[PDB]
Design a protein around this nucleic acid. Structure first.
Ligand SMILES: [Mg+2]
Ligand SMILES: [Mg+2]
Ligand SMILES: [Mg+2]
Ligand SMILES: [Mg+2]
Ligand SMILES: [Mg+2]
Ligand SMILES: [Mg+2]
Ligand SMILES: [Zn+2]
Lengths: 60, 117, 74, 102
RNA sequence: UUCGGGUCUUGUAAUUGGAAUGAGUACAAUGUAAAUACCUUAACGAGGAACAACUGGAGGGCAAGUCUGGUGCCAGCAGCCG
């Protein structure tokens, strides 16, 4: 109707959200190895050349 | 053996005259339409085969090939789709040629042997 | 510019008139005379042609190849 | 000024923590006070989506949702415009000690 | 003549190997008043090297999403603008 239930349930969206499980996500190399990964990501494997970096773009 | 039964089935399929199943076979053989009639030995209770034998004598010639499963498998029942036999199960258990289609090689020879000796 | 009420029905149900899966109607149709002649059963259609069996209901034998043509008393 | 605006419904029944109430007087700052049909005078706040979109006045049966932690206050949700109020009186979900007609 | 040798390099792969080693154990010894611990060192101690890095944040300020789904001026977020 006007409202599905009692408004101000004090935690409504948390109570009702579809709780999606976490993923597996193989281990990221953390430390200087993270600098490995990231430096290779940006400055030697140059990915987007036109205009700006646009790094982490929306897939569409 | 039986390499022309496939061929004549395909030729009649070209002209769409296969009395598939049994009811079409009966209605056609009571008429002067069915040319070749195949009933298989692998029929349960043998009443249908017995009736086919009684009727076809009366469109007289028949061929008594057994194992209708493979018959309807390659008699033109279903669809090949990919390379071969793309279906769960299929069969006819009785077939009748009403229209010849093609000719050449083995049309009336083994029918003369089987039905007219 | 309008919200529609649900179509509530005061009607129990009407289902598809299912066709009857008849098991071997031809044995019902024919009659074998001991490995030889074979007779047919209950009529043959003159309006449609030989081989088309007719319908048994009562005081009338009925067509169904050309259904409306033949329904006559016998 | 309807060009600036966003531009036959049915009633809605109370559901497990909300009640029909009759406004007794309209208070300032956008608040209001209503008798709930329990023998109680509660303080209702005019909720959003409601403030200056649809109005309300004294002597109007109107739906209000309670807040589970502080019963003494509540927030009004859904209004009833004088004809399904009679229907509300008819269906008997709320006591008929309060008739409102002009 | 389109090629295409990747001919020279860089990256990306739940493909695939053998190297190297400490956190931990622990012979001992040293270390100490006595000792722990460190500094050495036998033997042990890496495969997903589960021997797993969190904490905040991705509108601006301010580096980073106009991706997905959920809620729908409610819940909430937001130091300020919102
Ligand atoms: Mg407009
Ligand atoms: Mg309010
Ligand atoms: Mg670790
Ligand atoms: Mg956050
Ligand atoms: Mg995070
Ligand atoms: Mg930024
Ligand atoms: Zn007829």
């Amino acid at each position: 109707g006007k409202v599905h239930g009692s408004l101000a349930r004090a935690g409504k969206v948390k109570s009702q959200t579809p709780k999606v499980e976490k993923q597996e996500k193989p281990k990221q190399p953390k430390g200087r190895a993270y600098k490995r990964l990231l430096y290779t990501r940006r400055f030697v494997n140059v990915t987007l050349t036109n205009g700006k970096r646009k790094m982490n773009p929306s897939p569409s | 053996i039986e390499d022309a039964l496939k061929v004549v089935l395909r030729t009649s399929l070209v002209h769409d005259g296969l009395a598939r199943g049994l009811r079409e076979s009966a209605k056609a053989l009571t008429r002067g339409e069915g040319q070749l009639a195949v009933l298989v030995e692998s029929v349960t209770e043998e009443a249908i085969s017995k009736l086919v034998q009684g009727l076809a004598t009366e469109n007289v010639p028949l061929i008594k090939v057994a194992d209708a499963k493979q018959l309807g498998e390659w008699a033109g029942l279903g669809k090949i789709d990919r390379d071969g036999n793309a279906r769960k199960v299929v069969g006819a258990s009785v077939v009748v040629v009403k229209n010849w289609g093609a000719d050449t090689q083995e049309r009336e020879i083994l029918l003369e042997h089987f039905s007219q000796q | 510019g309008k919200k529609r009420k649900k179509k509530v029905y005061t009607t129990p149900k009407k289902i598809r008139h299912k066709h009857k899966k008849v098991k071997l109607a031809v044995l019902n149709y024919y009659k074998v005379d001991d490995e030889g002649k074979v007779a047919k059963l209950r009529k043959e259609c003159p309006n449609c042609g030989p081989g088309i069996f007719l319908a048994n209901h009562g005081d009338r034998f009925y067509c169904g190849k050309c259904h409306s043509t033949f329904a006559t008393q016998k | 000024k309807g060009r600036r605006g966003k531009n036959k419904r049915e009633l809605i029944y109370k559901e497990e923590g909300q009640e029909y109430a009759q406004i007794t007087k309209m208070l300032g700052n956008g608040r209001v006070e209503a008798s709930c049909f329990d023998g109680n005078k509660r303080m209702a706040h005019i909720r959003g989506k409601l403030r200056k979109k649809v109005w309300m006045g004294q002597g109007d049966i109107i739906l209000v949702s309670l807040r589970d932690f502080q019963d003494d206050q509540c927030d009004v949700v859904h209004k009833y415009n004088l004809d399904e109020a009679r229907t509300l009186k008819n269906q008997g979900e709320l006591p008929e000690n309060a008739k409102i007609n002009e």
